[PDB]
Amino acid sequence: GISRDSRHKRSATGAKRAQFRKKRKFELGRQPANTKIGAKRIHSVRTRGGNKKYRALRIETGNFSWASEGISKKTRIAGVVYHPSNNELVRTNTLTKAAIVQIDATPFRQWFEAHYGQTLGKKSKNAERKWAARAASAKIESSVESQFSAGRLYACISSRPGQSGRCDGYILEGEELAFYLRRLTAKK
Amino acid sequence: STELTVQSERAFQKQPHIFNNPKVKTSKRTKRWYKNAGLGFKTPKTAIEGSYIDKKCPFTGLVSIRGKILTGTVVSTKMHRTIVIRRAYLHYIPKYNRYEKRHKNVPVHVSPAFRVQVGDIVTVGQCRPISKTVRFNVVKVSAAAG
Amino acid sequence: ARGPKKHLKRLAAPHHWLLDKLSGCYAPRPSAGPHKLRESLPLIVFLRNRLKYALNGREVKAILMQRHVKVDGKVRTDTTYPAGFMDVITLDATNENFRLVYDVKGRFAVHRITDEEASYKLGKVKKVQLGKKGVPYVVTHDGRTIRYPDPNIKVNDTVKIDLASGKITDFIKFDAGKLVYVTGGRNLGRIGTIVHKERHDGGFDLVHIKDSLDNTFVTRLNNVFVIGEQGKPYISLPKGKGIKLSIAEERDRRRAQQGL
Amino acid sequence: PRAPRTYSKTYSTPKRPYESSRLDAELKLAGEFGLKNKKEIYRISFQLSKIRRAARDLLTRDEKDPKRLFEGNALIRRLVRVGVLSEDKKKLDYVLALKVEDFLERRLQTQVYKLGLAKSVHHA
RNA sequence: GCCCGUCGCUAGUACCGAUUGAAUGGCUUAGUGAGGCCUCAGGAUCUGCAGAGCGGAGAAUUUGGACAAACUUGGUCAUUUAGAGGAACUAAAAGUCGUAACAAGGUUUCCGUAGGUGAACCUGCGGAAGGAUCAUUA
RNA sequence: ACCCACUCGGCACCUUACGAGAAAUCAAAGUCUUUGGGUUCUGGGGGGAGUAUGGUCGCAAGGCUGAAACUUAAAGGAAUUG
RNA sequence: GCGGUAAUUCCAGCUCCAAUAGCGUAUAUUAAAGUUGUUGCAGUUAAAAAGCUCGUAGUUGAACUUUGGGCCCGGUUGGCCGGUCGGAUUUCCAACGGGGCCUUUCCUUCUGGCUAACCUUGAGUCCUUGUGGCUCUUGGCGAACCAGGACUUUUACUUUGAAAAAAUUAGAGUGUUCAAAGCAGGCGUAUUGCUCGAAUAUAUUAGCAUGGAAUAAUAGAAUAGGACG
RNA sequence: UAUCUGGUUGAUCCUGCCAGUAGUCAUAUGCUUGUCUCAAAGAUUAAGCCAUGCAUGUCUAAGUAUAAGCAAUUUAUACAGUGAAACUGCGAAUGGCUCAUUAAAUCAGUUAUCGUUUAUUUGAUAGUUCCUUUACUACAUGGUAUAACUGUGGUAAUUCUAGAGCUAAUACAUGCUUAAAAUCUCGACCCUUUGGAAGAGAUGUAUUUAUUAGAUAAAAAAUCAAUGUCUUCGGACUCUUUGAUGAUUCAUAAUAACUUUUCGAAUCGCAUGGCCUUGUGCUGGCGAUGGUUCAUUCAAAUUUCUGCCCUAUCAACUUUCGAUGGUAGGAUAGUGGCCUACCAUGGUUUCAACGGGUAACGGGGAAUAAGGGUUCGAUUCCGGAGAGGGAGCCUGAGAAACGGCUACCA
RNA sequence: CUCUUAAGGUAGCCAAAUGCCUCGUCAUCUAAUUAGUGACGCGCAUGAAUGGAUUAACGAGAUUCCCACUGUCCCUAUCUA
RNA sequence: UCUAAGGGUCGGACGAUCAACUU
């Protein structure tokens, strides 16, 4: 069916090669998975060697890393804002790698208020010895603290959910965040 | 041609898995990753003090140089972050027992740690096909005239 | 061709097995195993063609069905089993003990040994590598793997396995002046020293060699096998001592030796 | 698909087929040695030309060339063990001066009748 | 002696040649589009945890995409191939016209160019000698 | 200006030919089987044929490029005697 | 080219000729063919120098930069003896190359790792009146080669080597009875085993490693932005 | 083994050709033909069509036995021999045939995979699997649903098969078991310190993600954020861990999470022994098949560089619809315009591209023999491609299979 | 070879709008063609600025064939003002 | 129903602001 070969392709000199051999399965290609947002629908796939690929199609509950805090949570995936390759992916809220989105904030909220004892941008003397110790690392970026009021937080993808079946990524921080923020106020 | 302004493109071009924790304060503004490629090839300062990205540069990138190492002259400096090198050579005919001039052109990728042009006789090494013709990446570059 | 290959043709086998061009289209096509088939030896080759104990692979199979054979003290029943360098083979119904090694002409040699020295062997470390759980490990030329090694061991050295427990023991490093066997090329079967190593980062470092007769020659490094100290091999060596006479010396020895 | 069976031919024809002297001498040896046809003569000459090729090949090289030494001595002791050559001409030059009648005397066909027992090569 | 061209009879080789001449195969546009693959669905049929619900196994069928066989038409090249009639060549033994060339070949010969003429060819302009002059300081 | 002498570079000449060549002839057509100073172009029996076709250039004549089938045992060169 | 009446060629017969279980014919191809010409053609008249000139590519492209001398080293041939119970080595002899020193003469350099070798000497002795002789650490050798930094202008050519599938080719050994072939086989106590083997070469053009540094190119230091320190 | 000869002419010397010669592992054909050895053979034209028949099936002590099979012969009332058929597992992708395609395509030689998957072999490798953790959950072992079989039958017809009724698994689908250890979080309380602390829980492996370590090129000081041991309570901190590659984010470990949760043995044959607290208690050998991951092998795919015959009456080609490149994504086992968005206008060439032709598969190699060369190579070995042509596809580790399937054409 | 003209129609072109004969002959287009086209040429009576031959393009010019289209027609019917 | 591209004016690689039709 599909091919990834370069024999169908023209030459460096613009030249046209012949049909040297018929299509072969070891050069095959497969049609994509325009992974949407919905109930967990995943179709497993036999790849070469009997190794398995896992085509996601409809997802919530993505596993997202928070880098500065160095933790990782599972989050009700909200929606889509920006994609560099095609804006159609935002138009359909379709998921790939590099497929920026918003997500729930409440898990990270409660983690923060649990660990540091604080609140998000508004006893048990052992717990107090914990909270005071964690104090002065309990500060964060004002901009990221902003979205906590809104309850919806920006993140990026690190997976290929059309391969893994998983939708995993990480909350934005730093100057990458600032870049995509300039992009946010520029595009939206 | 030139060097860009790093995040000119639609996507935040960066070094993957290279995290610079903003909670941590520092005098440096970015954790830069680089490397030696080996074979005594000397990594330039520009890789390490620069801000350009170029994943396909053997320095500060994710290719790995190994295989053949060639040299050749530069003839085309047009495209973005890739050039063409001419390899002149000879071919022996026993019948007449003589040689003749042949040549072959080698499209390669170039780093924006180098800054080059026509002339500029090259050191270049094999780098695990990059895009459809380009199997070679610059490693070191010579001056031409002075 | 839609898969791997289950059939080999004569005229394609290794030249050093010494098969006639006739007698078949086909040769055993050695099985998967420790040794690569072109560097290896089948049992049927060892027995039928070299030791003449059997005459057909039928009989050879019958012999293996009798379980008369072991390899490294392990019973092995495959006709096409790829035996090779430094292995052990012993037979108890005849109480003979062997050790596989090439001639100076690079042909796998009939080298009988004692019941001891079928009690140990050698293994060239092809690499060391940090296996998971933090556990290190080592490998050999005969495909074996070993846990928890001597840290000072590094690549291209050799090691004294026990035989059956694994159980590495005293070993020898790669360094100058040592004793070496050759495992490839024109120089296959030869013996000599280390006299100098020539490094070439990028591929295929070389080693110069001096034999006992001050004959000198260079090889690739992957075909090296350190075997002991100079004038002190760790094993019993075959005849000729990998010393590479000339053709003139060959025929001279033949004609003089022969007679009386 | 088995091993091909090697083969070859043991002779070679002349370039010039109609030559009085050549025909005459061939027939002379035929009558002298009790022969069957020209194929046998041609075969001896063929072996001879092979040998002289080898001779030129060796002698092009330096004396003390181990190849030439080994091969010349082996060739010589072959030729003498068959007895075509005398006991003292044992040099790569005399072998070139060698000719076919020397080969032919060592025929069984010859040595029999030489050593009586036939009274004629044809009887032999 | 040698020899030339037209004309004439016969055979054959190839060329032009109206005939939108014919034929094979590719490659193709556009159109049509099989087939299975994945996909939205569907839910004959079985079923988990009075009946309840949720929850599975699930064929037919079906949405959509890609692959794309195959077909229609046109184009198109590459190769064969028919054709009145025309126009050359070659060959023949014993044809017609003449005698252009080889001798100063009877107008010295030849080249290029233009015209003309039954034919070879004649003439004009400009060259060559392969000429029929190695030569007129006297 | 004329004369002798000398030297550069010119058009050529005369004699011999060592040498070269099929020979005529040639100070180059020599320094060649003892086969190599560098370099461009052209030719491969005669005819068909510089014809056909295609292309290109030309106002046009015409030019430049350039075949095939088919046919044939000679054609031809220098030179000797008639 | 034979045959037009007495055919040396036809038709046969007789005789004779070459090859011979093989011989001929047709077509294709190789050598012949120096008639495709690198080696190795021709070009005034036999085919063939463009009408002439300029000119990019291509091909080629003047000379020139450490030569000479001196020292040591130890070899492999060839002699002169031959000691020896056909092969043997030391001196005598040259020849032939090869290596290393000095002649104003990188040895790429460090940072250490390492020292072996002594300028050592800290004690004197085995033993010939003593530098004949060696264990022996405390000032004091780099190169003997590990390993990281830095470059070395680079190519071309060449030597050697490795790496290079087998089979085929050449070729070694061997009575398949010879031979093509094959890789066997040959020796005793053939009633109780002994053993040799199954070579080697060629294996290119590209790539790799090394030695060479003539030849042919390339670079340097001239707005000194030069060098070394 | 470096060779020539006959023909132009009245004769002579050249050029130049025709013919003659020898060979051909290079075909056919004619004539002839006794023997020995050896042995090519429908490639040439029709990768043109094919009747018939044959060419891939497979069992050990050791997967499944109630054949309503056999033998009978012997401990067995669960079976125990043999063993059809069937289930299961493996293979059927090798091999063999052919050379039509294909002109830097293949193929040769030389690399590379720090850019890929890997049935099988061999060697290594798994104490953690459940549960708010006393009235628990098959572990002496948990569950159906099917053939084979029986019988009902249809079809003109195929290896077609429909209904009903039985029954197994190393089939299918489920599901427990196990040491301590320390480390982390959470914490009742108490007592204010310089703070100590019961007890609650987590901690196999795999998958996906983020982050960190993964040192080291030479020797000494100050500070602060914290937070470890020793206190000769002022304080010091002394022994103080580091793998490999030429080179990596490598190896691997660690933290926090993720998973329609991968594995962590409900299997089989021989033997049969020891221990008492005498249960039929507890222990206990040999090997057979499975299994995660790694390594190795078998390979496989991509891939560096150099090398292809004729053609200029083929000089510009390439970009519709990737033509060249970049960034991102998707897909692939995986790099890659492989494909998709977006952007840029590049990329090849008189050192001959592109196009055309090839009566072209490439190569190792064959023939010819002074030499250098030429010609050939369907063909006994390697590599590639194809199975009437095109396309697509399931299974499997592996096929775009064709002695496998679906569709279209003839 | 003759008579004869001032010259005796050359180049070229055709049964063409010029050709009686004539529906000229041959080929083609057609099933069938006094049509058309291309060839032929003793051309009643072609023919060179009374201009000859060709001529891209243009033509409310004359003519033939093809494709599509259609009540022109087979074969007529119906509807509106 | 949307996306992109294509301007002006004012303040110093930008910021603000207004309006358009066209692909």
Side-chain angles (χ1 to χ4, degrees):
Chain A
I2 304 153
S3 200
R4 331 193 310 286
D5 59 352
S6 280
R7 276 193 293 89
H8 85 264
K9 188 71 77 169
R10 287 181 145 291
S11 90
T13 63
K16 200 169 187 180
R17 320 180 182 172
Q19 179 253 329
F20 155 59
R21 59 183 146 181
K22 307 193 177 232
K23 275 193 209 164
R24 305 300 184 72
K25 191 262 172 189
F26 61 87
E27 58 163 56
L28 83 169
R30 270 186 272 240
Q31 187 170 1
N34 311 269
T35 53
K36 308 293 185 294
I37 321 189
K40 197 215 277 186
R41 187 183 277 182
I42 317 188
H43 285 210
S44 281
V45 177
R46 190 177 192 259
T47 84
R48 193 165 184 75
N51 306 268
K52 306 313 191 226
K53 263 171 195 174
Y54 290 80
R55 283 275 158 72
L57 295 169
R58 281 89 174 272
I59 307 294
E60 300 90 13
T61 75
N63 217 57
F64 285 83
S65 304
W66 198 352
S68 62
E69 312 307 276
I71 73 194
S72 297
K73 304 304 310 312
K74 187 146 175 172
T75 73
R76 195 213 198 183
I77 298 160
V80 188
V81 302
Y82 174 74
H83 198 287
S85 303
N86 191 339
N87 297 19
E88 179 141 55
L89 311 186
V90 188
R91 202 168 330 93
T92 73
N93 282 38
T94 297
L95 303 167
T96 85
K97 197 168 189 291
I100 309 320
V101 290
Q102 287 161 320
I103 57 173
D104 183 12
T106 56
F108 297 107
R109 286 186 72 77
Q110 206 157 32
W111 177 88
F112 190 86
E113 307 201 351
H115 183 78
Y116 300 97
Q118 319 302 345
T119 49
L120 279 294
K122 301 293 102 179
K123 60 179 166 284
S124 301
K125 183 169 277 193
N126 66 333
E128 300 296 341
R129 294 154 96 193
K130 288 173 202 182
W131 285 313
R134 295 153 194 204
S137 67
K139 297 180 294 308
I140 54 177
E141 170 47 59
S142 86
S143 298
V144 188
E145 182 55 283
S146 70
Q147 302 153 76
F148 277 95
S149 176
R152 294 283 183 259
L153 322 175
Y154 285 114
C156 168
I157 297 287
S158 53
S159 78
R160 275 143 71 75
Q163 303 296 282
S164 75
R166 305 258 185 89
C167 204
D168 295 335
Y170 70 108
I171 195 79
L172 308 185
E173 293 194 87
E175 287 288 5
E176 161 158 50
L177 167 51
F179 164 91
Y180 287 103
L181 274 156
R182 186 83 200 214
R183 297 283 180 276
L184 272 181
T185 307
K187 279 56 167 167
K188 179 67 225 172
Chain B
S1 82
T2 174
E3 55 255 16
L4 75 161
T5 71
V6 289
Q7 302 291 10
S8 68
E9 194 52 33
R10 299 193 52 65
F12 193 79
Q13 313 298 111
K14 69 175 185 175
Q15 306 187 278
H17 312 104
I18 317 312
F19 174 46
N20 37 21
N21 179 209
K23 288 203 81 150
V24 183
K25 316 323 304 154
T26 173
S27 298
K28 178 176 74 177
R29 305 342 308 175
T30 179
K31 258 169 51 166
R32 180 53 43 91
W33 187 89
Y34 71 106
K35 50 169 161 210
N36 185 4
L39 282 299
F41 288 120
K42 189 264 183 182
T43 299
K45 63 96 179 173
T46 308
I48 287 155
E49 67 96 20
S51 58
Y52 83 113
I53 291 279
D54 208 48
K55 67 192 189 171
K56 312 192 178 169
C57 175
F59 315 107
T60 66
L62 308 177
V63 307
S64 58
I65 292 283
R66 75 295 188 269
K68 284 194 170 291
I69 303 93
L70 262 57
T71 184
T73 191
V74 174
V75 60
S76 165
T77 78
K78 306 198 165 70
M79 292 186 281
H80 195 221
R81 299 181 141 192
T82 194
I83 76 156
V84 178
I85 283 156
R86 178 174 188 184
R87 276 234 298 169
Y89 70 88
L90 300 175
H91 183 221
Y92 175 45
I93 296 84
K95 203 208 188 211
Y96 314 100
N97 201 357
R98 292 152 196 285
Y99 306 134
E100 53 181 83
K101 311 204 301 206
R102 275 195 208 185
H103 83 290
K104 280 193 205 275
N105 306 55
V106 180
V108 312
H109 174 91
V110 50
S111 186
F114 310 90
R115 167 49 189 72
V116 313
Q117 48 192 346
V118 169
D120 298 338
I121 308 309
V122 177
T123 305
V124 76
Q126 202 184 6
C127 55
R128 57 151 279 262
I130 277 158
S131 96
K132 205 259 178 175
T133 62
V134 173
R135 277 50 160 158
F136 287 97
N137 194 339
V138 182
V139 190
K140 182 62 180 69
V141 172
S142 55
Chain C
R2 296 195 287 134
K5 279 183 176 297
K6 305 289 97 178
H7 279 105
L8 190 137
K9 277 192 189 173
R10 294 169 71 84
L11 311 156
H15 174 229
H16 69 101
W17 295 357
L18 287 185
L19 318 187
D20 54 357
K21 305 206 298 183
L22 275 296
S23 76
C25 277
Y26 296 149
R29 183 138 173 71
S31 306
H35 304 299
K36 289 180 305 318
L37 61 96
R38 192 165 283 257
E39 294 156 0
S40 78
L41 196 72
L43 300 179
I44 188 171
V45 170
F46 182 82
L47 303 166
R48 177 160 64 84
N49 308 111
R50 212 53 38 86
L51 307 203
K52 322 307 194 279
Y53 269 66
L55 301 175
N56 307 316
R58 185 182 294 199
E59 264 202 337
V60 175
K61 174 50 161 194
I63 291 146
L64 292 177
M65 292 298 92
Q66 296 291 306
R67 287 194 173 184
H68 288 326
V69 188
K70 309 173 237 163
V71 181
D72 213 305
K74 281 188 170 183
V75 167
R76 283 269 160 69
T77 194
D78 166 38
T79 304
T80 49
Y81 181 74
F85 204 49
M86 287 300 89
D87 301 311
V88 174
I89 305 316
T90 288
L91 300 172
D92 298 334
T94 187
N95 284 300
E96 290 174 84
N97 294 252
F98 292 72
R99 168 147 272 147
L100 274 174
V101 51
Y102 319 99
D103 294 325
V104 73
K105 291 282 191 70
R107 303 169 275 198
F108 264 111
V110 169
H111 183 46
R112 298 182 181 74
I113 64 178
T114 74
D115 284 28
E116 208 188 353
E117 197 173 5
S119 65
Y120 72 97
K121 73 181 269 192
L122 269 66
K124 163 158 147 74
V125 56
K126 300 292 293 191
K127 87 198 87 175
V128 69
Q129 176 168 304
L130 196 145
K132 76 195 302 215
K133 303 285 183 162
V135 165
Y137 67 102
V138 190
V139 307
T140 78
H141 66 279
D142 65 347
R144 300 173 159 286
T145 189
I146 295 294
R147 223 174 183 81
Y148 292 117
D150 166 84
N152 271 324
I153 283 165
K154 308 288 165 167
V155 188
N156 313 91
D157 305 321
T158 194
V159 172
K160 190 182 217 164
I161 309 101
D162 175 78
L163 283 181
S165 52
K167 288 296 202 283
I168 286 172
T169 69
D170 52 327
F171 71 98
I172 294 90
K173 286 290 296 191
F174 192 101
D175 47 287
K178 290 285 195 297
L179 205 51
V180 167
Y181 202 103
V182 185
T183 58
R186 302 158 192 75
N187 301 121
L188 174 43
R190 294 183 76 142
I191 299 170
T193 58
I194 326 305
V195 294
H196 185 222
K197 168 154 110 177
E198 210 66 7
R199 184 158 296 205
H200 287 300
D201 301 11
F204 316 119
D205 302 332
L206 320 182
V207 184
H208 315 94
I209 307 297
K210 186 184 275 171
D211 70 333
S212 86
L213 269 60
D214 301 331
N215 304 100
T216 64
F217 63 100
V218 192
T219 59
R220 305 292 206 75
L221 191 143
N222 312 312
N223 301 299
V224 176
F225 205 110
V226 293
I227 44 170
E229 191 263 346
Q230 172 163 12
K232 195 166 57 46
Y234 273 54
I235 66 182
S236 50
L237 301 173
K239 194 175 286 300
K241 313 304 204 73
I243 202 78
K244 187 54 177 294
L245 274 70
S246 89
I247 61 171
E249 302 175 336
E250 264 196 45
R251 57 93 170 157
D252 282 318
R253 291 286 199 73
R254 288 275 162 76
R255 76 177 298 190
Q257 187 267 5
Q258 294 287 118
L260 284 74
Chain D
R2 287 65 50 91
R5 191 64 154 291
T6 60
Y7 72 97
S8 292
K9 69 200 287 166
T10 54
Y11 67 96
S12 88
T13 62
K15 315 282 212 84
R16 290 174 173 281
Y18 309 107
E19 302 166 293
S20 81
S21 64
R22 189 170 58 71
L23 285 156
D24 288 24
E26 288 173 7
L27 175 51
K28 270 190 189 155
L29 303 184
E32 283 281 271
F33 287 73
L35 304 178
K36 165 64 190 324
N37 46 20
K38 309 297 190 82
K39 209 183 274 173
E40 317 172 288
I41 296 165
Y42 291 4
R43 153 170 68 190
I44 297 285
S45 65
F46 183 62
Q47 294 175 253
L48 190 141
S49 183
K50 269 193 224 294
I51 295 147
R52 295 198 311 92
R53 171 259 297 174
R56 293 201 294 288
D57 194 340
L58 272 78
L59 196 56
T60 36
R61 298 161 167 275
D62 64 78
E63 206 182 313
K64 312 154 91 166
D65 187 325
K67 189 190 301 218
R68 148 165 150 199
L69 300 160
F70 188 98
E71 275 181 337
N73 299 298
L75 180 138
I76 286 157
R77 68 100 185 170
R78 284 223 312 290
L79 282 151
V80 168
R81 177 151 77 76
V82 299
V84 168
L85 184 59
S86 70
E87 62 84 8
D88 54 357
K89 290 287 144 298
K90 293 158 61 160
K91 309 186 82 183
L92 319 184
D93 56 68
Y94 293 116
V95 310
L96 287 154
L98 204 71
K99 62 191 206 161
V100 295
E101 296 92 321
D102 310 315
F103 284 112
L104 210 69
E105 195 68 50
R106 307 297 298 146
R107 285 201 98 227
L108 194 143
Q109 187 62 48
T110 54
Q111 298 295 334
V112 166
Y113 163 85
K114 298 291 289 191
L115 190 67
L117 302 158
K119 204 167 185 294
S120 162
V121 300
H122 313 82
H123 202 161

